[PDB]
Amino acid sequence: VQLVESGGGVVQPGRSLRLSCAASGFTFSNYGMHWVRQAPGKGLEWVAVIWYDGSNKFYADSVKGRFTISRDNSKNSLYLQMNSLRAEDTAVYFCARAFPDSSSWSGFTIDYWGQGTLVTV
């Protein structure tokens, strides 16, 4: 089980950036996926989760309406489209494999993390 992020880099405020994550070692289409970001000197902040079938997309309050999470099961890949980036969005972005949360109907925790890619705005 491995996850590889790419598509990071340096952008200016107001411009967009698309990130992607390649999944292998497991059946991608059977698991939900998360994006999590970590600003330098800060703790982990959750960005979004997508269900294995791509039917349900949930976002953190701070990115809702700007970021879009999507998956392509055929290509075993996860995408995150970030529009209208701001200086506050500077962080290392990770993709991760979801794991069922026993205290919720369809809640998730995070099992496998990728190495992450740095995005500077």
């Binding site: 998360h34 999590v36 703790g43 982990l44 902040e45 959750w46 989760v49 949930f58 953190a60 309050d61 949360d101 205290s103 919720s104 109907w105 809640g107 998730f108 925790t109 995070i110």
Partner: peptide, 20 residues
């Protein structure tokens, strides 16, 4: 290492992390 506490908030469908 930095150990983080997290839960799933079913009220808002968000993963909530502590400071670490």
């Amino acid at each position: 290492a930095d150990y983080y506490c997290q839960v799933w908030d079913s009220g808002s469908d968000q993963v909530i992390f502590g400071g670490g």
